[PDB]
Amino acid sequence: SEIEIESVQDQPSVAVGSFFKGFRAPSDTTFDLYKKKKSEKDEFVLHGENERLEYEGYTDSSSQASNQYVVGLFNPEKKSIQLYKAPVLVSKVVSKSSKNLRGPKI
Amino acid sequence: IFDGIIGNDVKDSFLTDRLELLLRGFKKRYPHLQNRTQVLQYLGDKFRVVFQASPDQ
Amino acid sequence: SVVGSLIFCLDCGDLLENPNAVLGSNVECSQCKAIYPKSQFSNLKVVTTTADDAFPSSLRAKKSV
Amino acid sequence: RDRQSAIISHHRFITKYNFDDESGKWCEFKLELAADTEKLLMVNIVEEICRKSII
Ligand SMILES: [Zn+2]
């Protein structure tokens, strides 16, 4: 009893993102993908904006370099997986209120 | 921070409640520290007299 | 999100002001602007218990062996 | 019911009082406080009063 692998896709397409417990975002929120083609591997960066906040996520390069994440979609009935390499991105969300500051001194 | 502390441990009423006292209590004391930058300004501003870094920072 | 007796803003994750204390039938976040005391309202309860330590006794000692 | 109502009448915070009169196995009473009460560690308060009550 072992599951067979049907297909593997090796180039950027799907991504995975860590967020606060409760992230839901607008029905239309958009996620900008980036690709910093750095030497051997391309460290990725995600960036989005909404009406109040803007969310930016990135990979933990020193842990990214030592472990790599893969996501696949399996069908029980076709015994087939469409494999996708996906970056896991630890994303933080800043708001418009998070962009105000005081004087440079007292 | 909550997920950082309790995580999957959502069942510790002991910890859920102490942590509600901590986070809600901080929200009580400093309602105007709304983002990290303001907080940093409060720490630098409140210790600038003692870190000997003056107008130089 | 609501956890235990904490309810966090669903959009921004801020531990928004408790529905029980709002001056409206709908409060909002201090980071973003979401509507909550108005939407789903919660029924905040916690089953708090003793740590099974505060109450030493000979009878507890007869319960421990 | 007269006991519970009388104890409410003796104490400003308490609301209900159900007692296992069949043995004494538990003592339940409901305490209601205004929103303005914010937060306390009620378990810890109970513990402290438990070690301060003497039969
Ligand atoms: Zn919020």
PDB file of C-alpha atoms and ligand atoms in Angstrom:
ATOM      1  CA  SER A   1       0.000   0.000   0.000  1.00  0.00           C
ATOM      2  CA  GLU A   2       1.767   3.100  -1.313  1.00  0.00           C
ATOM      3  CA  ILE A   3       0.457   6.142  -3.166  1.00  0.00           C
ATOM      4  CA  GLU A   4       1.824   6.702  -6.678  1.00  0.00           C
ATOM      5  CA  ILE A   5       3.061  10.067  -7.964  1.00  0.00           C
ATOM      6  CA  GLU A   6       1.536  11.208 -11.263  1.00  0.00           C
ATOM      7  CA  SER A   7       3.177  14.520 -12.205  1.00  0.00           C
ATOM      8  CA  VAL A   8       5.657  17.036 -10.815  1.00  0.00           C
ATOM      9  CA  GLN A   9       5.741  20.764 -11.609  1.00  0.00           C
ATOM     10  CA  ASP A  10       9.093  22.312 -10.724  1.00  0.00           C
ATOM     11  CA  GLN A  11       8.639  25.994 -11.502  1.00  0.00           C
ATOM     12  CA  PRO A  12       7.044  28.750  -9.405  1.00  0.00           C
ATOM     13  CA  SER A  13       3.249  28.678  -9.392  1.00  0.00           C
ATOM     14  CA  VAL A  14       1.656  28.040  -5.982  1.00  0.00           C
ATOM     15  CA  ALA A  15       2.777  29.573  -2.690  1.00  0.00           C
ATOM     16  CA  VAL A  16       2.101  29.014   1.014  1.00  0.00           C
ATOM     17  CA  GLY A  17       1.803  31.797   3.566  1.00  0.00           C
ATOM     18  CA  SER A  18       1.941  31.972   7.359  1.00  0.00           C
ATOM     19  CA  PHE A  19      -0.372  34.531   8.972  1.00  0.00           C
ATOM     20  CA  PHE A  20      -2.031  35.499  12.242  1.00  0.00           C
ATOM     21  CA  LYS A  21      -4.757  33.138  13.473  1.00  0.00           C
ATOM     22  CA  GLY A  22      -7.765  34.709  11.785  1.00  0.00           C
ATOM     23  CA  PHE A  23      -6.478  36.076   8.496  1.00  0.00           C
ATOM     24  CA  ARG A  24      -9.270  36.250   5.911  1.00  0.00           C
ATOM     25  CA  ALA A  25      -8.717  39.461   3.865  1.00  0.00           C
ATOM     26  CA  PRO A  26     -11.146  40.930   1.320  1.00  0.00           C
ATOM     27  CA  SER A  27     -12.926  38.715  -1.176  1.00  0.00           C
ATOM     28  CA  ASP A  28     -10.478  40.154  -3.739  1.00  0.00           C
ATOM     29  CA  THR A  29      -7.198  40.745  -1.874  1.00  0.00           C
ATOM     30  CA  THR A  30      -4.248  40.213  -4.208  1.00  0.00           C
ATOM     31  CA  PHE A  31      -0.833  38.728  -3.480  1.00  0.00           C
ATOM     32  CA  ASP A  32       2.152  40.090  -5.380  1.00  0.00           C
ATOM     33  CA  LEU A  33       4.813  37.460  -5.992  1.00  0.00           C
ATOM     34  CA  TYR A  34       8.475  38.383  -6.366  1.00  0.00           C
ATOM     35  CA  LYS A  35      11.527  36.370  -7.362  1.00  0.00           C
ATOM     36  CA  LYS A  36      14.957  37.499  -6.205  1.00  0.00           C
ATOM     37  CA  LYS A  37      16.921  35.176  -8.501  1.00  0.00           C
ATOM     38  CA  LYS A  38      19.899  34.984  -6.149  1.00  0.00           C
ATOM     39  CA  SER A  39      22.641  32.601  -7.254  1.00  0.00           C
ATOM     40  CA  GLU A  40      21.612  28.962  -6.808  1.00  0.00           C
ATOM     41  CA  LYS A  41      18.125  29.601  -5.440  1.00  0.00           C
ATOM     42  CA  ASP A  42      15.522  32.353  -5.777  1.00  0.00           C
ATOM     43  CA  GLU A  43      14.502  33.719  -2.377  1.00  0.00           C
ATOM     44  CA  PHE A  44      10.902  34.867  -2.796  1.00  0.00           C
ATOM     45  CA  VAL A  45       8.997  37.845  -1.399  1.00  0.00           C
ATOM     46  CA  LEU A  46       5.225  38.443  -1.296  1.00  0.00           C
ATOM     47  CA  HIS A  47       3.639  41.907  -1.092  1.00  0.00           C
ATOM     48  CA  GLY A  48       0.016  43.023  -0.952  1.00  0.00           C
ATOM     49  CA  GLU A  49      -2.050  46.088  -0.084  1.00  0.00           C
ATOM     50  CA  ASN A  50      -5.625  46.669   1.054  1.00  0.00           C
ATOM     51  CA  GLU A  51      -7.866  49.625   1.922  1.00  0.00           C
ATOM     52  CA  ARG A  52      -6.343  49.829   5.412  1.00  0.00           C
ATOM     53  CA  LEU A  53      -3.411  47.460   5.668  1.00  0.00           C
ATOM     54  CA  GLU A  54      -0.597  46.058   3.573  1.00  0.00           C
ATOM     55  CA  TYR A  55       0.836  42.596   4.124  1.00  0.00           C
ATOM     56  CA  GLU A  56       4.395  41.580   3.309  1.00  0.00           C
ATOM     57  CA  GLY A  57       5.858  38.122   3.686  1.00  0.00           C
ATOM     58  CA  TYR A  58       9.234  36.542   3.164  1.00  0.00           C
ATOM     59  CA  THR A  59      11.102  33.269   3.578  1.00  0.00           C
ATOM     60  CA  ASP A  60      13.427  32.417   6.463  1.00  0.00           C
ATOM     61  CA  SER A  61      16.446  32.068   4.246  1.00  0.00           C
ATOM     62  CA  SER A  62      18.658  30.208   6.716  1.00  0.00           C
ATOM     63  CA  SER A  63      15.893  27.687   7.391  1.00  0.00           C
ATOM     64  CA  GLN A  64      14.696  27.852   3.780  1.00  0.00           C
ATOM     65  CA  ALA A  65      18.168  26.836   2.574  1.00  0.00           C
ATOM     66  CA  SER A  66      18.141  23.734   4.814  1.00  0.00           C
ATOM     67  CA  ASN A  67      14.580  22.529   4.143  1.00  0.00           C
ATOM     68  CA  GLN A  68      12.281  22.888   1.160  1.00  0.00           C
ATOM     69  CA  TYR A  69       8.506  22.710   1.057  1.00  0.00           C
ATOM     70  CA  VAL A  70       6.412  20.820  -1.476  1.00  0.00           C
ATOM     71  CA  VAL A  71       2.630  20.819  -1.923  1.00  0.00           C
ATOM     72  CA  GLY A  72       0.720  18.393  -4.119  1.00  0.00           C
ATOM     73  CA  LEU A  73      -2.875  17.687  -5.029  1.00  0.00           C
ATOM     74  CA  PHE A  74      -3.875  14.019  -4.881  1.00  0.00           C
ATOM     75  CA  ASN A  75      -6.997  12.384  -6.225  1.00  0.00           C
ATOM     76  CA  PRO A  76      -8.094   9.213  -4.400  1.00  0.00           C
ATOM     77  CA  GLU A  77      -9.883   7.996  -7.522  1.00  0.00           C
ATOM     78  CA  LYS A  78      -7.094   8.683 -10.030  1.00  0.00           C
ATOM     79  CA  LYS A  79      -4.246   7.912  -7.585  1.00  0.00           C
ATOM     80  CA  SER A  80      -2.489  10.921  -9.072  1.00  0.00           C
ATOM     81  CA  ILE A  81      -0.762  13.968  -7.601  1.00  0.00           C
ATOM     82  CA  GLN A  82      -0.006  17.244  -9.328  1.00  0.00           C
ATOM     83  CA  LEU A  83       3.140  18.247  -7.468  1.00  0.00           C
ATOM     84  CA  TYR A  84       3.975  21.915  -6.940  1.00  0.00           C
ATOM     85  CA  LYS A  85       7.007  23.487  -5.289  1.00  0.00           C
ATOM     86  CA  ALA A  86       5.646  26.226  -3.036  1.00  0.00           C
ATOM     87  CA  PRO A  87       7.465  28.820  -0.897  1.00  0.00           C
ATOM     88  CA  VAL A  88       6.303  29.168   2.698  1.00  0.00           C
ATOM     89  CA  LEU A  89       6.224  32.894   3.525  1.00  0.00           C
ATOM     90  CA  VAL A  90       6.050  34.266   7.081  1.00  0.00           C
ATOM     91  CA  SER A  91       3.936  37.369   6.411  1.00  0.00           C
ATOM     92  CA  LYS A  92       3.313  40.408   8.634  1.00  0.00           C
ATOM     93  CA  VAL A  93       0.472  42.920   8.219  1.00  0.00           C
ATOM     94  CA  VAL A  94       0.952  46.662   8.822  1.00  0.00           C
ATOM     95  CA  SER A  95      -1.949  49.113   8.733  1.00  0.00           C
ATOM     96  CA  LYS A  96      -2.232  52.789   7.845  1.00  0.00           C
ATOM     97  CA  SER A  97      -2.284  53.480  11.583  1.00  0.00           C
ATOM     98  CA  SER A  98       0.999  51.547  11.831  1.00  0.00           C
ATOM     99  CA  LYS A  99       2.642  54.239   9.657  1.00  0.00           C
ATOM    100  CA  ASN A 100       2.474  57.223  12.033  1.00  0.00           C
ATOM    101  CA  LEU A 101       5.302  58.437  14.247  1.00  0.00           C
ATOM    102  CA  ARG A 102       6.196  61.107  16.736  1.00  0.00           C
ATOM    103  CA  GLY A 103       8.788  63.885  16.560  1.00  0.00           C
ATOM    104  CA  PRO A 104      12.434  62.786  16.435  1.00  0.00           C
ATOM    105  CA  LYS A 105      12.778  63.870  20.070  1.00  0.00           C
ATOM    106  CA  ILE A 106      10.661  65.032  22.999  1.00  0.00           C
TER     107      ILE A 106
ATOM    108  CA  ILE B   1       1.922  37.002  20.442  1.00  0.00           C
ATOM    109  CA  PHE B   2      -0.973  34.865  21.666  1.00  0.00           C
ATOM    110  CA  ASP B   3      -0.190  32.202  19.086  1.00  0.00           C
ATOM    111  CA  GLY B   4       3.459  32.597  20.035  1.00  0.00           C
ATOM    112  CA  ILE B   5       2.698  31.812  23.666  1.00  0.00           C
ATOM    113  CA  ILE B   6      -0.195  29.356  23.847  1.00  0.00           C
ATOM    114  CA  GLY B   7      -0.181  28.044  20.290  1.00  0.00           C
ATOM    115  CA  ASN B   8      -2.061  24.752  19.985  1.00  0.00           C
ATOM    116  CA  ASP B   9      -2.495  24.875  23.795  1.00  0.00           C
ATOM    117  CA  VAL B  10      -5.842  26.683  23.440  1.00  0.00           C
ATOM    118  CA  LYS B  11      -7.177  24.656  26.388  1.00  0.00           C
ATOM    119  CA  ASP B  12      -5.240  26.281  29.252  1.00  0.00           C
ATOM    120  CA  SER B  13      -7.908  28.456  30.836  1.00  0.00           C
ATOM    121  CA  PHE B  14      -5.120  29.251  33.297  1.00  0.00           C
ATOM    122  CA  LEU B  15      -2.890  30.468  30.493  1.00  0.00           C
ATOM    123  CA  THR B  16      -5.662  31.908  28.336  1.00  0.00           C
ATOM    124  CA  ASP B  17      -6.763  34.071  31.242  1.00  0.00           C
ATOM    125  CA  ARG B  18      -3.347  35.194  32.460  1.00  0.00           C
ATOM    126  CA  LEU B  19      -2.491  36.049  28.860  1.00  0.00           C
ATOM    127  CA  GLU B  20      -5.720  38.012  28.497  1.00  0.00           C
ATOM    128  CA  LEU B  21      -4.690  39.973  31.578  1.00  0.00           C
ATOM    129  CA  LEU B  22      -1.276  40.616  30.027  1.00  0.00           C
ATOM    130  CA  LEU B  23      -2.355  41.680  26.541  1.00  0.00           C
ATOM    131  CA  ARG B  24      -5.562  43.441  27.554  1.00  0.00           C
ATOM    132  CA  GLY B  25      -3.694  45.135  30.394  1.00  0.00           C
ATOM    133  CA  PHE B  26      -1.039  46.474  28.040  1.00  0.00           C
ATOM    134  CA  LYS B  27      -3.778  47.694  25.716  1.00  0.00           C
ATOM    135  CA  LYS B  28      -5.164  49.413  28.813  1.00  0.00           C
ATOM    136  CA  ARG B  29      -2.022  51.261  29.883  1.00  0.00           C
ATOM    137  CA  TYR B  30      -0.743  52.505  26.500  1.00  0.00           C
ATOM    138  CA  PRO B  31      -3.696  52.938  24.125  1.00  0.00           C
ATOM    139  CA  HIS B  32      -1.636  55.272  21.901  1.00  0.00           C
ATOM    140  CA  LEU B  33       1.345  52.937  21.222  1.00  0.00           C
ATOM    141  CA  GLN B  34      -0.649  51.612  18.300  1.00  0.00           C
ATOM    142  CA  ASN B  35       2.336  50.409  16.262  1.00  0.00           C
ATOM    143  CA  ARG B  36       5.878  49.161  16.735  1.00  0.00           C
ATOM    144  CA  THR B  37       7.449  52.442  15.628  1.00  0.00           C
ATOM    145  CA  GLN B  38       5.633  54.477  18.270  1.00  0.00           C
ATOM    146  CA  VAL B  39       6.701  51.907  20.875  1.00  0.00           C
ATOM    147  CA  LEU B  40      10.325  52.221  19.771  1.00  0.00           C
ATOM    148  CA  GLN B  41      10.017  55.989  20.049  1.00  0.00           C
ATOM    149  CA  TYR B  42       8.687  55.594  23.585  1.00  0.00           C
ATOM    150  CA  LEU B  43      11.590  53.353  24.633  1.00  0.00           C
ATOM    151  CA  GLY B  44      14.286  55.506  23.037  1.00  0.00           C
ATOM    152  CA  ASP B  45      12.557  58.649  24.259  1.00  0.00           C
ATOM    153  CA  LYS B  46      12.177  57.270  27.779  1.00  0.00           C
ATOM    154  CA  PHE B  47      15.768  56.002  28.058  1.00  0.00           C
ATOM    155  CA  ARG B  48      17.514  58.629  25.919  1.00  0.00           C
ATOM    156  CA  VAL B  49      18.578  60.422  29.100  1.00  0.00           C
ATOM    157  CA  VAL B  50      20.497  57.337  30.210  1.00  0.00           C
ATOM    158  CA  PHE B  51      21.941  55.618  27.133  1.00  0.00           C
ATOM    159  CA  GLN B  52      24.186  58.640  26.489  1.00  0.00           C
ATOM    160  CA  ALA B  53      23.206  58.778  22.811  1.00  0.00           C
ATOM    161  CA  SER B  54      21.692  62.288  22.817  1.00  0.00           C
ATOM    162  CA  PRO B  55      20.655  64.436  19.807  1.00  0.00           C
ATOM    163  CA  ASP B  56      23.213  62.201  18.152  1.00  0.00           C
ATOM    164  CA  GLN B  57      20.171  59.967  17.796  1.00  0.00           C
TER     165      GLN B  57
ATOM    166  CA  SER C   1     -11.446  35.797  15.928  1.00  0.00           C
ATOM    167  CA  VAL C   2     -12.684  34.863  19.408  1.00  0.00           C
ATOM    168  CA  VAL C   3     -10.539  32.734  21.731  1.00  0.00           C
ATOM    169  CA  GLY C   4     -11.646  31.855  25.248  1.00  0.00           C
ATOM    170  CA  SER C   5     -12.634  35.308  26.440  1.00  0.00           C
ATOM    171  CA  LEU C   6     -10.349  37.156  24.023  1.00  0.00           C
ATOM    172  CA  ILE C   7     -11.766  38.161  20.643  1.00  0.00           C
ATOM    173  CA  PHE C   8      -9.205  39.273  18.053  1.00  0.00           C
ATOM    174  CA  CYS C   9      -9.948  41.406  15.009  1.00  0.00           C
ATOM    175  CA  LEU C  10     -10.614  39.038  12.112  1.00  0.00           C
ATOM    176  CA  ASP C  11      -8.932  41.277   9.534  1.00  0.00           C
ATOM    177  CA  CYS C  12      -5.891  42.504  11.467  1.00  0.00           C
ATOM    178  CA  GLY C  13      -5.443  40.149  14.429  1.00  0.00           C
ATOM    179  CA  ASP C  14      -5.633  42.951  16.997  1.00  0.00           C
ATOM    180  CA  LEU C  15      -7.174  41.986  20.341  1.00  0.00           C
ATOM    181  CA  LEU C  16     -10.077  44.390  19.801  1.00  0.00           C
ATOM    182  CA  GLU C  17     -11.934  46.044  22.685  1.00  0.00           C
ATOM    183  CA  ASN C  18     -14.217  43.617  24.481  1.00  0.00           C
ATOM    184  CA  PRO C  19     -17.815  43.557  23.150  1.00  0.00           C
ATOM    185  CA  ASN C  20     -19.078  43.756  26.734  1.00  0.00           C
ATOM    186  CA  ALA C  21     -17.848  47.326  27.235  1.00  0.00           C
ATOM    187  CA  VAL C  22     -18.522  49.106  23.911  1.00  0.00           C
ATOM    188  CA  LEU C  23     -20.640  52.274  23.952  1.00  0.00           C
ATOM    189  CA  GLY C  24     -22.352  51.027  20.788  1.00  0.00           C
ATOM    190  CA  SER C  25     -24.223  48.051  19.410  1.00  0.00           C
ATOM    191  CA  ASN C  26     -21.066  47.720  17.307  1.00  0.00           C
ATOM    192  CA  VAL C  27     -17.438  48.334  18.323  1.00  0.00           C
ATOM    193  CA  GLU C  28     -14.396  48.522  16.058  1.00  0.00           C
ATOM    194  CA  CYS C  29     -10.690  47.766  15.952  1.00  0.00           C
ATOM    195  CA  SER C  30      -8.050  50.198  17.176  1.00  0.00           C
ATOM    196  CA  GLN C  31      -5.751  49.078  14.360  1.00  0.00           C
ATOM    197  CA  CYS C  32      -8.208  48.590  11.492  1.00  0.00           C
ATOM    198  CA  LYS C  33     -11.932  49.345  11.430  1.00  0.00           C
ATOM    199  CA  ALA C  34     -13.988  46.161  11.571  1.00  0.00           C
ATOM    200  CA  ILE C  35     -17.565  45.834  12.811  1.00  0.00           C
ATOM    201  CA  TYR C  36     -18.178  43.365  15.629  1.00  0.00           C
ATOM    202  CA  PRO C  37     -20.324  44.271  18.598  1.00  0.00           C
ATOM    203  CA  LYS C  38     -22.788  44.633  15.663  1.00  0.00           C
ATOM    204  CA  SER C  39     -22.033  41.370  13.896  1.00  0.00           C
ATOM    205  CA  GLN C  40     -21.677  37.995  15.628  1.00  0.00           C
ATOM    206  CA  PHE C  41     -21.621  38.751  19.307  1.00  0.00           C
ATOM    207  CA  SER C  42     -19.987  35.837  21.112  1.00  0.00           C
ATOM    208  CA  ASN C  43     -21.079  34.162  24.346  1.00  0.00           C
ATOM    209  CA  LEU C  44     -17.825  34.439  26.298  1.00  0.00           C
ATOM    210  CA  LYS C  45     -17.399  31.671  28.891  1.00  0.00           C
ATOM    211  CA  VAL C  46     -14.449  29.861  30.464  1.00  0.00           C
ATOM    212  CA  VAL C  47     -14.466  26.640  32.497  1.00  0.00           C
ATOM    213  CA  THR C  48     -11.810  27.684  34.982  1.00  0.00           C
ATOM    214  CA  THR C  49     -10.615  25.112  37.502  1.00  0.00           C
ATOM    215  CA  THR C  50      -8.292  24.646  40.442  1.00  0.00           C
ATOM    216  CA  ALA C  51      -4.709  23.513  39.823  1.00  0.00           C
ATOM    217  CA  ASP C  52      -5.192  20.481  42.118  1.00  0.00           C
ATOM    218  CA  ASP C  53      -2.544  21.966  44.417  1.00  0.00           C
ATOM    219  CA  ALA C  54      -4.152  24.743  46.511  1.00  0.00           C
ATOM    220  CA  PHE C  55      -5.914  22.221  48.780  1.00  0.00           C
ATOM    221  CA  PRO C  56      -3.453  19.959  50.613  1.00  0.00           C
ATOM    222  CA  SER C  57      -5.001  17.611  53.138  1.00  0.00           C
ATOM    223  CA  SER C  58      -4.839  14.198  54.755  1.00  0.00           C
ATOM    224  CA  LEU C  59      -7.877  13.204  52.700  1.00  0.00           C
ATOM    225  CA  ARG C  60      -6.153  14.328  49.522  1.00  0.00           C
ATOM    226  CA  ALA C  61      -3.241  12.243  50.760  1.00  0.00           C
ATOM    227  CA  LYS C  62      -5.602   9.274  50.969  1.00  0.00           C
ATOM    228  CA  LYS C  63      -6.569  10.048  47.362  1.00  0.00           C
ATOM    229  CA  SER C  64      -2.973   9.989  46.070  1.00  0.00           C
ATOM    230  CA  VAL C  65      -1.719   6.438  46.663  1.00  0.00           C
TER     231      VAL C  65
ATOM    232  CA  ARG D   1     -35.234  29.076  47.783  1.00  0.00           C
ATOM    233  CA  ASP D   2     -35.649  31.060  51.012  1.00  0.00           C
ATOM    234  CA  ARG D   3     -32.048  30.274  51.926  1.00  0.00           C
ATOM    235  CA  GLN D   4     -30.696  31.354  48.538  1.00  0.00           C
ATOM    236  CA  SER D   5     -32.815  34.522  48.548  1.00  0.00           C
ATOM    237  CA  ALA D   6     -31.791  35.248  52.142  1.00  0.00           C
ATOM    238  CA  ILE D   7     -28.099  34.862  51.333  1.00  0.00           C
ATOM    239  CA  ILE D   8     -28.549  37.153  48.356  1.00  0.00           C
ATOM    240  CA  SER D   9     -30.142  39.457  50.921  1.00  0.00           C
ATOM    241  CA  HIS D  10     -27.006  39.201  53.076  1.00  0.00           C
ATOM    242  CA  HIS D  11     -24.426  39.575  50.284  1.00  0.00           C
ATOM    243  CA  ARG D  12     -24.463  42.199  47.551  1.00  0.00           C
ATOM    244  CA  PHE D  13     -22.773  40.190  44.777  1.00  0.00           C
ATOM    245  CA  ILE D  14     -24.342  36.734  45.014  1.00  0.00           C
ATOM    246  CA  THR D  15     -27.299  35.685  42.879  1.00  0.00           C
ATOM    247  CA  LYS D  16     -27.928  31.924  43.059  1.00  0.00           C
ATOM    248  CA  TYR D  17     -27.294  29.229  45.653  1.00  0.00           C
ATOM    249  CA  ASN D  18     -27.638  25.517  44.896  1.00  0.00           C
ATOM    250  CA  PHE D  19     -26.375  23.124  47.566  1.00  0.00           C
ATOM    251  CA  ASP D  20     -26.094  19.330  47.604  1.00  0.00           C
ATOM    252  CA  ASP D  21     -28.285  18.977  50.685  1.00  0.00           C
ATOM    253  CA  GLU D  22     -28.325  15.223  49.992  1.00  0.00           C
ATOM    254  CA  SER D  23     -24.694  14.909  51.081  1.00  0.00           C
ATOM    255  CA  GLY D  24     -22.749  18.159  50.946  1.00  0.00           C
ATOM    256  CA  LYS D  25     -20.697  17.186  47.904  1.00  0.00           C
ATOM    257  CA  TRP D  26     -20.801  20.678  46.431  1.00  0.00           C
ATOM    258  CA  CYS D  27     -21.874  24.278  46.967  1.00  0.00           C
ATOM    259  CA  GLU D  28     -22.749  26.317  43.876  1.00  0.00           C
ATOM    260  CA  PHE D  29     -23.607  30.010  43.859  1.00  0.00           C
ATOM    261  CA  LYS D  30     -23.778  32.378  40.910  1.00  0.00           C
ATOM    262  CA  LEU D  31     -21.955  35.704  41.068  1.00  0.00           C
ATOM    263  CA  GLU D  32     -22.813  38.445  38.582  1.00  0.00           C
ATOM    264  CA  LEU D  33     -20.714  41.567  38.070  1.00  0.00           C
ATOM    265  CA  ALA D  34     -20.979  44.626  35.860  1.00  0.00           C
ATOM    266  CA  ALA D  35     -18.894  44.867  32.680  1.00  0.00           C
ATOM    267  CA  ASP D  36     -16.981  47.574  34.596  1.00  0.00           C
ATOM    268  CA  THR D  37     -15.471  44.618  36.501  1.00  0.00           C
ATOM    269  CA  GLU D  38     -12.957  43.992  33.675  1.00  0.00           C
ATOM    270  CA  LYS D  39     -10.887  40.971  34.693  1.00  0.00           C
ATOM    271  CA  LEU D  40      -9.795  39.028  37.752  1.00  0.00           C
ATOM    272  CA  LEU D  41      -8.294  35.607  38.463  1.00  0.00           C
ATOM    273  CA  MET D  42     -11.331  34.205  40.208  1.00  0.00           C
ATOM    274  CA  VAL D  43      -9.829  30.740  40.722  1.00  0.00           C
ATOM    275  CA  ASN D  44      -6.918  32.302  42.602  1.00  0.00           C
ATOM    276  CA  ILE D  45      -9.258  34.390  44.749  1.00  0.00           C
ATOM    277  CA  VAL D  46     -11.274  31.293  45.596  1.00  0.00           C
ATOM    278  CA  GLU D  47      -8.133  29.361  46.531  1.00  0.00           C
ATOM    279  CA  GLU D  48      -7.006  32.187  48.806  1.00  0.00           C
ATOM    280  CA  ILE D  49     -10.351  32.346  50.556  1.00  0.00           C
ATOM    281  CA  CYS D  50     -10.416  28.550  50.858  1.00  0.00           C
ATOM    282  CA  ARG D  51      -7.219  28.569  52.868  1.00  0.00           C
ATOM    283  CA  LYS D  52      -8.643  31.438  54.964  1.00  0.00           C
ATOM    284  CA  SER D  53     -11.946  29.752  55.889  1.00  0.00           C
ATOM    285  CA  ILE D  54     -12.030  27.475  58.932  1.00  0.00           C
ATOM    286  CA  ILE D  55     -14.621  24.896  59.898  1.00  0.00           C
TER     287      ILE D  55
HETATM  288 ZN    ZN E   1      -8.641  44.707  14.091  1.00  0.00          ZN
END
